[PDB]
Amino acid sequence: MKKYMIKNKNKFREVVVYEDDELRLRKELKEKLEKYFIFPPCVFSFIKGRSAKDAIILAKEYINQYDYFFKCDIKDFFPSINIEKLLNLLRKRVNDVKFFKELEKLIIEDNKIADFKGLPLGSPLSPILSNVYLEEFDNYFYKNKKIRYLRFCDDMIFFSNANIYDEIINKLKELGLNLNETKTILGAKGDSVKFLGIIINFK
Ligand SMILES: [Mg+2]
Ligand code: NA
């Protein structure tokens, strides 16, 4: 028994497949896995102590400080996650072999439920694993002193004095990821932008 239930938006895999118990083991592993990662502070989704509201406050500050901004969003993010790349990223930090083994088994089970298309939206593990997946991407743009960068799930905005969207698109391609070309916004200083549903104005 499992049709569908719109959750945040749509999807076309996972459903009342996930209903409890298996949720507990996934929720327990998620809490265990949070102790292995400190994601860069420019990432605001699925992390205790952070929220979309924080990203909006930072965006409203950063927009006054750069000549350009680029707002974009990853297309079909969770279905697009490469499992082999995700498991290589996990093993670099989860050096507890028993915990890594349990995580790997569940990820492979979740991927099968997703019909081998990335991670299912109904698994409690998928959100934190999406942050693992983009951690090196996030740090690459975070640690650049000449730009600012904010991400909430698949939604990103970059503030810079030189346009970098070609580099963004390429770094995403290294992860198997693409932008939703329809929702991409470039702006010059003085322009407003919609980010996470909020209009952010210069000054
Ligand atoms: Mg998207
Ligand atoms: Na930066």
Author numbering: 1 to 203
Paper text:
A highly divergent group of RTs, predominantly related to group II intron RTs (GIIiRT), are genetically associated with a subset of Type III CRISPR-Cas operons and reportedly play roles in spacer acquisition from RNA. We demonstrate that RT-dependent priming is utilized by some CRISPR-Cas complexes to synthesise new spacers and integrate these into CRISPR arrays.
To elucidate the role(s) of CARTs in CRISPR-Cas spacer acquisition, we first characterised the synthesis activities associated with the RT domain of Caloramator australicus CaCART-CAPP (CCJ33120). To better understand the architecture of CARTs, we elucidated the crystal structure of RT domain of CaCART-CAPP at 1.63 Å, crystallised in space group P32 with 3 monomers in the asymmetric unit. The architecture of the RT catalytic core is composed of a ‘palm’ subdomain with an RNA Recognition Motif like (RRM-like) fold, which contains catalytic acidic residues bound to a single metal ion (manganese coordinated by D73, I74 and D154) and ‘fingers’ subdomain, adhering to the canonical ‘hand’ analogy for replicative polymerases. The N-terminal part of the ‘fingers’ subdomain is highly dynamic, reflected by the high B-factors in the modelled residues (average of 122.0 Å2 for atoms in the first 20 residues, compared to 40.4 Å2 for the rest of the monomer). The structure of CaCART-CAPP RT domain was elucidated by molecular replacement using a bacterial Geobacillus stearothermophilus GsI-IIC intron RT (GsRT) from the GIIiRT protein family. The catalytic core of GIIiRTs contains three major extensions, which differentiates them from retroviral RTs, including an N-terminal extension (NTE), Motif 2 extension (RT2e) and Motif 3 extension (RT3a). Deletion of the β-hairpin from CaCART-CAPP ablates its polymerase and primase activities, similar to replacing residues in the equivalent region of Marinitoga piezophila CAPP (MpCAPP) or HsPrimPol implicated in nucleotide binding. In conclusion, RT domain of CaCART-CAPP is a bona fide DNA primase and polymerase, that is active on both DNA and RNA templates, initiates de novo synthesis with NTPs or dNTPs, and has a strong preference for priming on templates containing a CC sequence.
